[PDB]
Amino acid sequence: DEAEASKFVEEYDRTSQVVWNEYAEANWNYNTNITTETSKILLQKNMQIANHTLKYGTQARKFDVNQLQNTTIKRIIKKVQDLERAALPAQELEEYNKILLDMETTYSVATVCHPNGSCLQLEPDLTNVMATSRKYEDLLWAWEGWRDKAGRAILQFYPKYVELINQAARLNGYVDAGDSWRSMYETPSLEQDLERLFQELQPLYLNLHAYVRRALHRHYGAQHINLEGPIPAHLLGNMWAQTWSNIYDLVVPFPSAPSMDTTEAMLKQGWTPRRMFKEADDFFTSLGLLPVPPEFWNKSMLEKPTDGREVVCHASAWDFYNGKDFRIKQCTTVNLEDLVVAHHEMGHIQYFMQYKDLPVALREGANPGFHEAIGDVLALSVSTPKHLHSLNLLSSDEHDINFLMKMALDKIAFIPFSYLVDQWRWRVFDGSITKENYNQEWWSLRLKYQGLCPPVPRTQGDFDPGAKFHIPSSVPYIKYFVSFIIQFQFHEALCQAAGHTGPLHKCDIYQSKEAGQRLATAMKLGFSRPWPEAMQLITGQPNMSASAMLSYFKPLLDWLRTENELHGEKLGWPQYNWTPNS
Ligand SMILES: *[C@@H]1O[C@H](CO[C@@H]2O[C@@H](C)[C@@H](O)[C@@H](O)[C@@H]2O)[C@@H](O[C@@H]2O[C@H](CO)[C@@H](O[C@@H]3O[C@H](CO)[C@@H](O)[C@H](O)[C@@H]3O)[C@H](O)[C@H]2NC(C)=O)[C@H](O)[C@H]1NC(C)=O
Ligand SMILES: C[C@H](CS)C(=O)N1CCC[C@H]1C(=O)O
Ligand SMILES: [Cl-]
Ligand SMILES: [Cl-]
Ligand SMILES: [Zn+2]
């Protein structure tokens, strides 16, 4: 009956609030202080939430979903029918929980040491080396070292992780874990749509790639860069070469039009991690969106502890499922990179606050890409020279191309990377890639999509995917690719709503109530409606589209084409088998 389904959903919501709140606190503690005690209590509260999930999941499966009138109730019960890991038998569930914890801990505590003495952590030590070093061998030491210590140490867990996560997926009606992850977008054409979006960004990426390769040839020498081949993976200023902004100094289009060092300016003007988040909060409220509760400032970990405690430094935002307690956990360094990250995380909080009155089962983004996009949209306006000057962090066509380049190194370079991560994982989950070929197929995709090669030939036992946080942490990655496409669509739509005219990249939406209103109406929908509805609320149309991102970067595309043609660059990497001779 229709009445029994409504009652079930009401009972689910009530009991879920209590249990999910309890789990959130226990998960917070392990992430903020990795010990043996906190690892145990997390696993005990893990079985508690699994107990609830199993109880209500089993009940939900007794309801005939498609023979149910109300669409909101129908949708909730359908989601509760997916038990996820709680579908595993007790022994497999215990093993699976143990593996995830083991992989995450291994990643978190891995260090790279000189035999002399000094041991380096990923953050900030190895990250800093990757960002600042302009010495080929020193970059190699950190690049290889991190893979040797973190990547290699994840390999022993991964095949069993794959087995158990696929099993849980099959027990919930999917064919494998990748199938289950993709289903979050509720879009049959997902794979085709993403491929077309990626293809639309080829002219821009290939031109950026060719230009950067030429600049690296200039700095690192003709003997170490093949102008028709892939770029060695350790030279892009980032451990994973996923964003390239840290090598801006090597690639600046107009060196005679330099801008202020914002990181130096932040440190100069005494910018605290707490000020960085206060500024993000101001931007949201300027748009007419919600301020963070007083409780947020009291309970968030906005900086790496000087206590010397082992933490998960990876930046994340937290919903405690009571509509009052929201937190950010971040090991914040004072720079521009983390100022954008601060807006990114505050975007998650805004989303939490906006949909807090919905049933717990519908308290997520329209799709995972939406949750990731919100903060980045505001950060786009923040990053403009106009806005950076109003923050006293900065003091012509040449400055224009320079700024666009800086943006391109982050936003454009990230496209092929964010695309490839789950292209790899989907093929691991569906069985196309076995443990014999994990690493080799990872590098095939790094070549195919990003046009990169490893500086050092990989050996048996290498598991370079393991050296990227989201792999041992089992966090789906395709959302970041969606985010980067759609955030430019949102920027474009909000800029139109704010009455901005002229080049899209010149837009700053600060204080625009019309912009804030479009985001608010979409964000309040939570997961209650198919994502194209939220897309239509923001942009006036229902599709994902790369046209906004292309429009944003159009002046840079023109510049890159002229510059690359001038030097006769080959677009792409026709000599695709080239690897460093060293
Ligand atoms: C299908 O059912 C949904 C959800 O129903 C809700 O959940 C059920 C399990 C039961 O507990 C119901 O009692 C409960 O309503 C219905 O959506 C709901 O619609 C009403 C409007 O009729 C919304 O109420 C609003 O509440 C705000 C409070 O801030 C007021 O300002 C508004 O004026 C308005 O009264 C309610 O929020 C909404 N619930 C959800 C979860 O979206 C829906 O009406 C129903 N559809 C059909 C076709 O019957
Ligand atoms: C910090 C966020 C998690 S909320 C993240 O993992 N990001 C943000 C963009 C890409 C990806 C990454 O760091 O690899
Ligand atoms: Cl790698
Ligand atoms: Cl995702
Ligand atoms: Zn995020």
Numbering used by the authors: 40 to 434, 439 to 625
Show the paper's wording.
Somatic angiotensin-converting enzyme (sACE), a key regulator of blood pressure and electrolyte fluid homeostasis, cleaves the vasoactive angiotensin-I, bradykinin, and a number of other physiologically relevant peptides. sACE consists of two homologous and catalytically active N- and C-domains, which display marked differences in substrate specificities and chloride activation. There is also a smaller testicular form of ACE (tACE), which is transcribed from the same gene and identical to the C-domain of ACE. The active site for both domains is contained within the large central groove, with the signature HEXXH zinc-binding motif residing on the α15 helix. ACE activity is dependent on chloride ions, with the degree of dependence being substrate-specific.
There is no evidence from the electron density map of the R522K·captopril structure that the chloride is linked to Lys522 with the amino group located more than 4 Å away from a water in the ion's hydration shell. The chloride ion is coordinated by the hydroxyl group of Tyr224 and the surrounding water molecules linked to Trp220, Trp469, and Asp465. Importantly, Lys522 now forms a salt bridge with Glu411, which is part of the zinc coordination motif and thus involved in the enzyme catalytic activity. Lys522 is also within the distance of a cation-π interaction with Tyr523, thus further directing the side chain away from the Cl− ion. Although its presence did not disturb the catalytic pocket, the ligand interacts with Tyr523 through a hydrogen bond and π stacking of its proline group with the phenol of Tyr523.
